[PDB]
Design a protein around this ligand. Structure first.
Ligand code: HEM
Ligand SMILES: c1ccc(-c2cnc[nH]2)cc1
Length: 375
């Protein structure tokens, strides 16, 4: 269990992320802390180009390697996309590419910014005695003034944490199935349903803290990758680390272990078959920290909650199971509405979206198809 690096309070998010690196990495830290200015005034690229190659060995624990991932990943996005107006670098300079690749290998993560970087590790309490609420939180790194990264990253994080309340119930679910404890099972499912329902309310804050124009035309540009991306159709050259350019997807909540873990728990077969949706979500596992990916693997290897509940002729159980599925449908439905507002409308207003809506609708529909009764 401790092997899975799941926090009782923050779930898959990294508890108390670190904010400073050893003095030895000030050169990295200074660029990452000043990205809005450096990018805007056109100093970012030359600074990166002028860095000495720093060794990764003075990053001695997990939290500090994670902070360096976040730093280097942000710097890399800034360097590749520049001011975010379509002029793009195709080579990442060795003095940054080499340690970032080394560090990424060590953490078993791709050398690009992932969800686990810019959400799960990218946050702090303002006041350590107050609760984890938006007003008491901040992010550690942004790209551009006005990019709304704080609102986008924190509200993801807050959803992620609300859903974590349910994660701790999962061992109860499996124990109750093996012990044939019917009332314990039912209570456990109603409790998962309740947390996933809470996570929806938390989603509503996206409208308060993120503005569609700034999201669509700025933040989205900095989070994009180089896989199947025509601005970088062969990927990115990690100078000095690989000979050939490599492709990696940009940061995506398809990399959240939260939603993937409930789809597995409930037997919603999100990654089955060979369609586009299933493959993208299977591929996104390779972007999750290894401990969380081992967690998903071990969920798949347990007996099926859905089969258990379907074989019992127990309406109470059926309805508790359906309330879990329905909570996921509701969340995915609200999310589709958000995408219409934050991507589809802004895109239509500028002087593709159908493949995106269809991907999301396929995932929602596969979730709906899992309802036992129809509700
Ligand atoms: C402005 C707000 C948001 C926009 C524009 C948006 C956009 C998208 C897009 C474009 C995808 C497709 C895959 C990809 O391109 O990476 C997606 C998938 C997804 N998003 Fe968001 N998103 C938003 C907010 C959120 C938030 C707050 C969460 C909560 C953690 C979230 C969870 C997901 C998940 C889990 C998927 C994967 C498909 C699924 O499991 O249903 N999104 N989103
Ligand atoms: C950081 C936070 C959230 C996201 C995201 C939201 N929906 C899809 N990806 C991507 C990066």
């Amino acid at each position: 269990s401790k092997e899975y690096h799941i926090d009782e309070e923050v779930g898959f998010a990294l508890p108390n992320p670190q904010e400073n690196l050893p003095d030895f990495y000030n050169d990295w830290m200074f660029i990452a802390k000043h990205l809005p200015d450096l990018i805007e005034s056109g100093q970012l690229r030359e600074r990166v180009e002028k860095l000495n190659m720093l060794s990764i060995d003075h990053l001695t624990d997990h939290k500090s390697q994670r902070l360096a991932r976040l730093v280097l990943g942000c710097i890399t996005m800034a360097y590749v996309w520049g001011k975010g107006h379509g002029d793009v670098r195709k080579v990442l300079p060795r003095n940054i590419a080499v340690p970032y690749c080394q560090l990424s290998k060590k953490l078993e993560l791709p050398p690009i910014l992932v969800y686990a970087d810019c959400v799960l590790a990218n946050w702090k309490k303002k006041d350590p005695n107050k609760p984890l609420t938006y007003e008491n939180m901040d992010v550690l790194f942004s790209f551009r003034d006005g990019d709304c990264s704080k609102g986008f990253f924190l509200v993801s994080l807050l959803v992620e944490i609300a859903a974590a309340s349910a994660i701790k119930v999962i061992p109860t679910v499996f124990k109750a199935m093996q012990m044939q404890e019917r009332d314990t099972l039912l209570k456990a499912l109603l409790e998962i349903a309740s947390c996933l329902e809470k996570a929806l309310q938390v989603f509503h804050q996206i409208h308060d803290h993120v503005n569609p124009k700034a999201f669509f035309s700025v933040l989205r540009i900095y989070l994009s990758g180089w896989k199947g991306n025509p601005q970088l159709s062969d990927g990115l050259v990690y100078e000095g680390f690989w000979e050939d350019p490599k492709e990696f997807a940009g940061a995506s909540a398809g990399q959240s272990s939260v939603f993937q873990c409930f789809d597995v728990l409930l037997g919603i077969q999100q990654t089955a078959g060979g369609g586009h949706a299933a493959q993208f979500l299977q591929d996104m596992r390779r972007y999750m920290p290894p401990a969380h990916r081992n967690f998903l693997c071990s969920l798949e290897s347990n007996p099926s909650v859905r089969e258990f509940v379907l074989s019992k002729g127990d309406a109470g159980l059926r309805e508790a199971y359906d309330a879990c599925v329905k909570a996921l449908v509701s969340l995915r439905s609200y999310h589709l509405q958000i995408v219409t507002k934050y991507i589809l409308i802004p895109a239509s207003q500028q002087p593709g979206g159908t493949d995106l809506m269809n991907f999301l609708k396929t995932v929602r529909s596969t979730t709906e198809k899992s309802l036992l009764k129809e509700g």
